[PDB]
Amino acid sequence: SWDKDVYPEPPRRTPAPSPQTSLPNPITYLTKAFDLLVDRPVTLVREFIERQHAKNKYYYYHREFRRVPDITECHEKDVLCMFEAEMQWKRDYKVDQEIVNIIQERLKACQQREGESHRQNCAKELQQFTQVVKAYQDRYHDLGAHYSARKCLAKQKQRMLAERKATKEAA
Amino acid sequence: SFPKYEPSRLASLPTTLDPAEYDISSETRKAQAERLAIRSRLKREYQLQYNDPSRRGVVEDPALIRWTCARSANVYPNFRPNTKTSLLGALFGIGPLIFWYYVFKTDRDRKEKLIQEGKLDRTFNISY
Amino acid sequence: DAPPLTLEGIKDRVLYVLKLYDKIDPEKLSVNSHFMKDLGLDSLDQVEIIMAMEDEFGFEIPDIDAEKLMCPQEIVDYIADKKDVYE
Amino acid sequence: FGFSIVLVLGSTFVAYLPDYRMQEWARREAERLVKYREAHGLPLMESNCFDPSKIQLPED
Amino acid sequence: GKRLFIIKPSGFYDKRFLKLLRFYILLTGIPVVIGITLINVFIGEAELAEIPEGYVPEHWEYFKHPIS
Amino acid sequence: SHITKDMLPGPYPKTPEERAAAAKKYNMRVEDYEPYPDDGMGYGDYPKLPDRSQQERDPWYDWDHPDLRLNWGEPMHWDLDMYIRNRVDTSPTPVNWNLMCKHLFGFVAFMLFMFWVGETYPTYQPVGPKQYPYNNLYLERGGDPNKEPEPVVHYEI
Amino acid sequence: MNLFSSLTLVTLILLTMPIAAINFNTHKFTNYPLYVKTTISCAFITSMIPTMMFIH
Amino acid sequence: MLKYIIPTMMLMPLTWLSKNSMIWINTTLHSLLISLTSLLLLNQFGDNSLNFSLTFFSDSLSTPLLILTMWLLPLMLMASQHHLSKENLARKKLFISMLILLQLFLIMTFTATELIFFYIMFEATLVPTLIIITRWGNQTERLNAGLYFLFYTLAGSLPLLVALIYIQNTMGSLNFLILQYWVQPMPNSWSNTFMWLACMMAFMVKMPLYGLHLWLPKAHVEAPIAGSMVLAAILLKLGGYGMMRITLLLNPITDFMAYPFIMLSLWGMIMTSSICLRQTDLKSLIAYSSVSHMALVIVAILIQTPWSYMGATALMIAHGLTSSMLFCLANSNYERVHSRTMILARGLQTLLPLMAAWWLLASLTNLALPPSINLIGELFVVMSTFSWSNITIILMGLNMVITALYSLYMLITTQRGKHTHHINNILPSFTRENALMSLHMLPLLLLSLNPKIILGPLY
Amino acid sequence: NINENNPFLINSIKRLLIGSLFAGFIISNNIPPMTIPQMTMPHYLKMTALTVTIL
Amino acid sequence: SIFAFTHVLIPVWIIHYYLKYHVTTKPYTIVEKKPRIFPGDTILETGEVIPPMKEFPDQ
Amino acid sequence: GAHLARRYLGDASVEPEPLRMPTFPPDYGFPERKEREMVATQQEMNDAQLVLQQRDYCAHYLIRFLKCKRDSFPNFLACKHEQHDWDYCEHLDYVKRMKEFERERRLLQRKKRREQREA
Amino acid sequence: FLPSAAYLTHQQKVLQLYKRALRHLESRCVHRDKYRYFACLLRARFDEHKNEKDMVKATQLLREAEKEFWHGQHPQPYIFPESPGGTSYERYECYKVPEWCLDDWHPSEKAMYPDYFAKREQWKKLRRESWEREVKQLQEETPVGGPRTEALPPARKQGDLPPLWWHIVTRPRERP
């Protein structure tokens, strides 16, 4: 299955039409015909294959990692600390990209569901999108391509120094 | 009647209003006869070597070889650096490059000042 | 787009539209006649004949073959060359 | 030995292979983390990725 | 009787190359696809357990497809 | 094979014999050989032709190359790559070239000028705005779920 | 409704059988125009349905 | 990695103690086996590269180019007969063993660790190519072509050694992690300007850039087919690969001093696309095509986006395959007629009717077919450079138009319109040529199906 | 050699004149309404289509 | 019958076999745009009546 | 139309410009003329996915038209009464917009020329 | 620009003017009966002054007629759809495969088509059979050391075929 906590679906809405026709009803006969022509034999072959999969079952796990000390807690150069620190940072960068992918997929799903009036019960997901992406824009954006982790920490120090000067001129 | 069809470096001049062809003298008759003689001898030699079934290769135009070896290798001799050649070269080698160089300087200076004030469209400009 | 054409049929069609042209006498219409020699009609009328050929049959014959047909036998031979009139 | 043991074997080898630079693992890792930060109150993807207790600045 | 004789450049070399190409891909095109079919119809792909209490696996057992 | 005398070393001097040798080797008349001249742009001493040469040359001559317009011995003007049919059509024009570019530039500027006249002088049909119902159709514009309801109503007219 | 997706994707995939078939053929089809015409006609009759479902 | 190096050594005495009509099958079969063996490499994961020793390591910048090398060898080997197959057996053995030594130092070069080792194996890549192109160049100016080749590449790539020795004995060792993890952003004095210009100008000479692009075309029109494919594909994308390796240091001052190289590369791409439109001698068209694509790669490297690096290496692999294929079709045409010219052999849709399909497919993949790898490359390069500056899209699009035009003219000049009906020695298509076309164009379309392999280190 | 007694051509022309007679009305009429049908014209503004054709 | 039999039964079977299990184990996948409910109706699935449309006059 | 020729050739003073219409203030010749029932059930207008610029006056007639077209779909030529009724309602709305235009036009002409031709 | 002379002549030049003017009048005039009228008016207008024995007056009026033709021609004249310029222009060149090939086949297909290939073999045996003597004897004997024409005389003397006939007779059919 898939976790519906992280992949939210809105609850279903389905009207009940009832003609008020006398042609009557081509597509009703045709959807019953499609059901009895495709939906039964594919499911019978799939039941055969599901018994064959129920002969014996493998398992795969989710890969688990520990926590490194820091990049802020290593020594001067001393590579065999910073290597571990920066690989943990690189995995944070990878999972952060996948977080942004998840938020963008949720937004596209909201667009296709909610019809031509976009601005009703999609504005909340648009707001959380602008939240997370303003964070990512100020965090990981302007660093070029020859990063390891050190340019990110330099950006971090520079930005919080900018905030310190900002509250210095403010108060 | 007609404004006489001034030609151009694109417009061809058709055979009617030349008006040099209708200035017939013995020069033109003799030169056209010798031009027919030259085309006669060339097509004669070509049709001689053109029909041999014993032959297998191609007929090997020397004019094709000549034009290619002129236009490929024999461009560099001869040459002297003339003011015509040197000025035309300094215009066609440096000019457009220094031009779009200046426009990259101007556009980047505008963009760097606009992001130095920070009033850019990087509300969400992630894919840099 | 394929009519089965032959020498005899297109020979008769060329001779037919030569005969249909009025000011030459159809009594003295041999295939081995000549459009200047034995019937005496001028070369301008021969170019009228040329345009009659090209409007019946729908293909140009060029300026290099405008001087040098001058008789219906060579017209039939030149058309049989140009259209390749065989089965 | 140029197609029938090369091309189709390479087609099998690159048609499926493990998570090359961690695709499926990154999918499930981001799913677990968004589940955590939506079932635990704080907003997902806190900015300022380093802990500001773990930082120092040259003063004015 | 009616029909002329068409001119053709060559056919034998080209038909020979195409039959050789499709056949020498077909020689291990069919067994490979039947192999991947029997793999995902007999042995299973996998299922999705979690890591139990202190049982550390090998570097494998982390992947969906069994040939992976 | 091939001898270096069949390439083209140097220009037209000296004046009798080099013109003679170029006309012998390039299969041309003596006075019809007319070089560029020695301009300093390289160019050897290759011949010069009347430059159009490809929607010229009536094909009822039936020379050898039916679409390359060769004759196996013609000197083949230096810009022959640009000349071949499917690259550049140097046909004799039906009217002019100056008269055509005059009328085309005048017609295009004329149409864009009437367009500018249109851009400052619009038409419409005489009727007020579409009266949108609820605060200029609020909540379905840019956002604002409770932030800024900006009040306006309509009157039965 | 998986009916709609199934009919639309087979209107796509019907226009993959002819080209792949004669790439895999290496033979002379004499009714190959007939074959292209009938696969286009069957593609029409499989694409006529889900539009009717759409406005329905 | 020595499991790749040492069988390519041991493949050499195969050709020595194999007899007449028996060197051939052994070399071809066993190099295809080694191609399987390096198809086995692809193990790359997650945190970093794969270290194959204290001595070797494999990036994801390195893996597709290494696969390209060990796959382009046997294609080249079957490609390079009938121009020396009638010749002598000892000279044939010398030729094939020379190519194997060439491949060996290419693998040495691509899987380098310290940049000194990279430089030694760089000019070890250089030296067999010289002897190959000069000994079988088969035209009167192969002399001058090889001489310009060696003097340009050495004289450009001479001070790169001095800068590498300097960075060695001022900032420690030269493995890519300790080349990384320690390198400070270097300030803008004029000494730093010279060191940056030394490294980058050496590789500018290698690619070529437009300022020294006349390095190339003599050494492509006056080289045999093995040396041609080696030169174009493996040497130019090797130069780009070396640039990508070295450009991690000196990143702060490159925004100050990188502005003229972008301009020279852009206007050179425009002028090179213009010059490959009107030339005769069909072989030269592919050479200036290569100069155009490598100018686009150079723009892509001196802008520093991960988009730009992914698109750069994709464009590398795509034009390597396309130019190598199109060189092999030019060799097909020259085996047909002993011409080297362009306007001579026309027609050829009738004659060899399936040669049309491979010329069409080569001109499509040069044409940036929209799921091909070439359009992937040019697309990400144009995206990154429009992120760089908003006005540089015009030159890219004029490049696109002229690229499509010269590719179409190269297609329909030789193989369209009217057979000259005096050739009468062309033969129908061999099985060899269509086999070589099929060996080019199946992996390109397969990588078009799933390109999650060939994008860069910043995937 | 003017021949048109061809079953394929008469079938195809027949079917496309059916498509040029009924199918425009059929495709046009059961559209989902997404735009505003204007329909509110003065004199000599709606008449001008037929006026242009006749003139 | 075998001709149109294979051409309209084999691809529909394989595509609908493709459009259950793979298409649901890829979670964010084929998504419908919602049926436009109208006020004189009821939801077919759960079941409650939408109150119909309000005051009609001034027509 | 002819009004456009008059607006361009004559005085540009007395002419109200479209899309910058409201000049004279409200409750002027109005007073106590506003009901604006608008019984379209705006939440049901939101729930039923209706188009922008169809979220306007005479909405419920469009609601009924869509309801009958959904109820009798293979009846291809059934809903024409409600079609014509909805057309009639928004024709009345166009009449209302026309009258609002000409009322402001008469106001601007008569008021401005009374003031600036007697004062 | 012809095999048989250097210049064309005066009379055929006037004749080319007549034929092009007649063609452009076809192009100008639809409905064909008023075309026949205008054509006869053109025939009389050219038959105004045939009897002028002056040469320079005749070519002056010829150049004036060229001016009047050039100002009065049609932009898209009715060209024939087999001529160059027209619609066909080697339209069916797709199957104009040259006949020097068709012999580089596999002999399986030569076993399929036996009798045509036997007759082609005896064509080529006639070609080599009557190749050297009469052809190259008349080529190096009957012209002058400057041959100064393009056409060749037939091998009328004693025996075999008129020289250089292979690529003139054995050519494709222009409508396969």
CSV table of N, CA and C in Angstrom, one decimal, chain H residues 27-91:
chain,number,residue,atom,x,y,z
H,27,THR,N,40.9,-10.4,-31.2
H,27,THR,CA,40.8,-9.0,-30.7
H,27,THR,C,39.4,-8.6,-30.6
H,28,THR,N,38.5,-8.8,-31.6
H,28,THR,CA,37.2,-8.4,-31.5
H,28,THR,C,36.4,-9.0,-30.4
H,29,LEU,N,36.4,-10.4,-30.3
H,29,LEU,CA,35.7,-11.1,-29.3
H,29,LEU,C,36.1,-10.7,-27.9
H,30,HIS,N,37.4,-10.6,-27.7
H,30,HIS,CA,37.9,-10.4,-26.4
H,30,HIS,C,37.7,-8.9,-25.9
H,31,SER,N,37.7,-8.0,-26.8
H,31,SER,CA,37.4,-6.6,-26.5
H,31,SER,C,35.9,-6.5,-26.2
H,32,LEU,N,35.1,-7.2,-26.9
H,32,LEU,CA,33.7,-7.2,-26.5
H,32,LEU,C,33.5,-7.8,-25.1
H,33,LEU,N,34.2,-8.9,-24.8
H,33,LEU,CA,34.2,-9.4,-23.4
H,33,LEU,C,34.6,-8.4,-22.3
H,34,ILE,N,35.6,-7.6,-22.6
H,34,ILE,CA,36.0,-6.6,-21.7
H,34,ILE,C,35.0,-5.5,-21.6
H,35,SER,N,34.2,-5.2,-22.7
H,35,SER,CA,33.1,-4.3,-22.7
H,35,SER,C,32.0,-4.8,-21.7
H,36,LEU,N,31.7,-6.1,-21.7
H,36,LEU,CA,30.9,-6.6,-20.7
H,36,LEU,C,31.4,-6.4,-19.3
H,37,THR,N,32.8,-6.6,-19.2
H,37,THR,CA,33.4,-6.5,-17.9
H,37,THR,C,33.4,-5.1,-17.3
H,38,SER,N,33.4,-4.1,-18.1
H,38,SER,CA,33.2,-2.7,-17.6
H,38,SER,C,31.8,-2.3,-17.6
H,39,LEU,N,30.9,-3.0,-18.3
H,39,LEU,CA,29.5,-2.8,-18.0
H,39,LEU,C,29.1,-3.3,-16.6
H,40,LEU,N,29.9,-4.2,-16.1
H,40,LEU,CA,29.7,-4.6,-14.7
H,40,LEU,C,30.1,-3.5,-13.6
H,41,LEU,N,30.7,-2.4,-14.0
H,41,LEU,CA,31.3,-1.5,-13.1
H,41,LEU,C,30.2,-0.8,-12.3
H,42,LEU,N,29.0,-0.6,-12.8
H,42,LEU,CA,28.1,0.5,-12.4
H,42,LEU,C,27.5,0.2,-11.1
H,43,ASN,N,28.2,0.6,-10.0
H,43,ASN,CA,27.9,0.3,-8.6
H,43,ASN,C,27.7,1.5,-7.8
H,44,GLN,N,27.5,2.7,-8.4
H,44,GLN,CA,27.8,3.9,-7.8
H,44,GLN,C,26.6,4.4,-7.0
H,45,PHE,N,26.8,4.9,-5.8
H,45,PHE,CA,25.7,5.0,-4.8
H,45,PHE,C,26.0,6.2,-3.9
H,46,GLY,N,24.9,7.0,-3.6
H,46,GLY,CA,24.8,7.7,-2.4
H,46,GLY,C,25.8,8.8,-2.0
H,47,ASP,N,26.6,8.4,-1.0
H,47,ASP,CA,27.4,9.4,-0.4
H,47,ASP,C,28.6,9.9,-1.3
H,48,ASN,N,29.3,9.0,-1.9
H,48,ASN,CA,30.4,9.5,-2.7
H,48,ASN,C,30.7,8.5,-3.9
H,49,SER,N,31.8,8.6,-4.4
H,49,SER,CA,32.2,7.8,-5.6
H,49,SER,C,32.6,6.4,-5.1
H,50,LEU,N,33.2,5.6,-6.0
H,50,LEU,CA,33.8,4.3,-5.6
H,50,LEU,C,35.3,4.4,-5.6
H,51,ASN,N,35.9,4.1,-4.5
H,51,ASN,CA,37.4,4.1,-4.5
H,51,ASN,C,37.9,2.7,-4.9
H,52,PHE,N,38.3,2.5,-6.1
H,52,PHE,CA,39.1,1.4,-6.5
H,52,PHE,C,40.6,1.6,-6.4
H,53,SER,N,41.0,2.1,-5.2
H,53,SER,CA,42.2,1.6,-4.4
H,53,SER,C,42.6,2.8,-3.6
H,54,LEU,N,43.8,2.7,-3.0
H,54,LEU,CA,44.6,3.9,-2.9
H,54,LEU,C,44.9,4.6,-4.2
H,55,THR,N,44.9,3.9,-5.3
H,55,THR,CA,45.3,4.3,-6.6
H,55,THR,C,44.2,4.8,-7.5
H,56,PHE,N,43.0,4.2,-7.5
H,56,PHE,CA,42.0,4.5,-8.5
H,56,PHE,C,40.7,4.9,-7.8
H,57,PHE,N,39.9,5.7,-8.5
H,57,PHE,CA,38.5,5.9,-8.0
H,57,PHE,C,37.6,6.3,-9.3
H,58,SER,N,36.4,5.9,-9.2
H,58,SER,CA,35.4,6.0,-10.2
H,58,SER,C,34.3,6.9,-9.8
H,59,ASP,N,34.2,8.1,-10.4
H,59,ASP,CA,33.0,9.0,-10.2
H,59,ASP,C,31.9,8.6,-11.1
H,60,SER,N,30.8,9.3,-11.1
H,60,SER,CA,29.7,9.2,-12.1
H,60,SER,C,30.0,10.1,-13.3
H,61,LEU,N,31.0,11.0,-13.2
H,61,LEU,CA,31.6,11.6,-14.3
H,61,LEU,C,32.5,10.7,-15.1
H,62,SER,N,33.0,9.7,-14.4
H,62,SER,CA,34.0,8.8,-15.0
H,62,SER,C,33.4,7.5,-15.6
H,63,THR,N,32.4,7.0,-14.9
H,63,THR,CA,31.8,5.7,-15.4
H,63,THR,C,31.2,5.8,-16.8
H,64,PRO,N,30.4,6.7,-17.2
H,64,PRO,CA,29.9,6.7,-18.6
H,64,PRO,C,31.0,6.9,-19.6
H,65,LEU,N,32.0,7.7,-19.4
H,65,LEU,CA,33.1,7.9,-20.3
H,65,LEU,C,33.9,6.6,-20.4
H,66,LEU,N,34.1,5.9,-19.3
H,66,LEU,CA,34.9,4.7,-19.3
H,66,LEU,C,34.1,3.6,-20.1
H,67,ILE,N,32.8,3.5,-19.9
H,67,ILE,CA,32.0,2.6,-20.7
H,67,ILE,C,32.1,3.0,-22.1
H,68,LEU,N,32.1,4.3,-22.4
H,68,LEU,CA,32.2,4.7,-23.8
H,68,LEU,C,33.5,4.3,-24.5
H,69,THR,N,34.6,4.4,-23.7
H,69,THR,CA,35.9,4.0,-24.2
H,69,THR,C,35.9,2.5,-24.5
H,70,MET,N,35.6,1.7,-23.5
H,70,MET,CA,35.7,0.2,-23.7
H,70,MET,C,34.6,-0.3,-24.6
H,71,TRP,N,33.6,0.5,-24.9
H,71,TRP,CA,32.6,0.1,-26.0
H,71,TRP,C,33.0,0.6,-27.3
H,72,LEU,N,33.7,1.7,-27.4
H,72,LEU,CA,34.1,2.3,-28.7
H,72,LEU,C,35.3,1.6,-29.3
H,73,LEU,N,36.0,0.8,-28.5
H,73,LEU,CA,37.2,0.1,-29.0
H,73,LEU,C,36.8,-1.0,-30.1
H,74,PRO,N,35.9,-1.9,-29.9
H,74,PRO,CA,35.8,-3.0,-30.9
H,74,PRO,C,35.0,-2.5,-32.1
H,75,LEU,N,34.1,-1.6,-31.9
H,75,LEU,CA,33.4,-0.9,-33.0
H,75,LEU,C,34.5,-0.2,-34.0
H,76,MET,N,35.5,0.4,-33.4
H,76,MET,CA,36.6,1.0,-34.1
H,76,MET,C,37.4,-0.1,-34.8
H,77,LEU,N,37.6,-1.2,-34.1
H,77,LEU,CA,38.5,-2.3,-34.6
H,77,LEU,C,37.9,-2.9,-35.9
H,78,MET,N,36.6,-3.2,-35.9
H,78,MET,CA,36.0,-3.7,-37.1
H,78,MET,C,35.9,-2.6,-38.1
H,79,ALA,N,35.8,-1.3,-37.7
H,79,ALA,CA,35.7,-0.2,-38.6
H,79,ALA,C,37.0,0.0,-39.4
H,80,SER,N,38.1,-0.4,-38.8
H,80,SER,CA,39.4,-0.1,-39.4
H,80,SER,C,40.1,-1.2,-40.2
H,81,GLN,N,39.3,-1.9,-40.9
H,81,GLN,CA,39.8,-2.8,-41.9
H,81,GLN,C,39.4,-2.3,-43.3
H,82,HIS,N,39.9,-3.0,-44.3
H,82,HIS,CA,39.8,-2.8,-45.8
H,82,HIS,C,40.6,-1.6,-46.2
H,83,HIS,N,41.2,-0.8,-45.3
H,83,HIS,CA,42.2,0.2,-45.7
H,83,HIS,C,43.5,-0.2,-45.2
H,84,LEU,N,43.7,-1.3,-44.5
H,84,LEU,CA,44.9,-1.9,-44.2
H,84,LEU,C,44.8,-3.5,-44.3
H,85,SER,N,43.7,-4.0,-44.6
H,85,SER,CA,43.6,-5.5,-44.6
H,85,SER,C,44.3,-6.1,-45.8
H,86,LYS,N,44.5,-5.4,-46.9
H,86,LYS,CA,45.3,-5.9,-48.0
H,86,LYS,C,46.8,-5.7,-47.7
H,87,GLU,N,47.2,-4.9,-46.7
H,87,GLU,CA,48.6,-4.6,-46.4
H,87,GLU,C,49.2,-5.7,-45.6
H,88,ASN,N,50.4,-5.4,-45.1
H,88,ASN,CA,51.3,-6.5,-44.5
H,88,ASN,C,50.9,-6.8,-43.1
H,89,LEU,N,51.2,-8.1,-42.7
H,89,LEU,CA,50.7,-8.7,-41.5
H,89,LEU,C,51.4,-8.0,-40.3
H,90,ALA,N,52.7,-7.8,-40.4
H,90,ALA,CA,53.4,-7.2,-39.2
H,90,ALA,C,53.0,-5.7,-39.0
H,91,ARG,N,52.7,-5.0,-40.0
H,91,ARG,CA,52.2,-3.6,-39.9
H,91,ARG,C,50.8,-3.7,-39.3
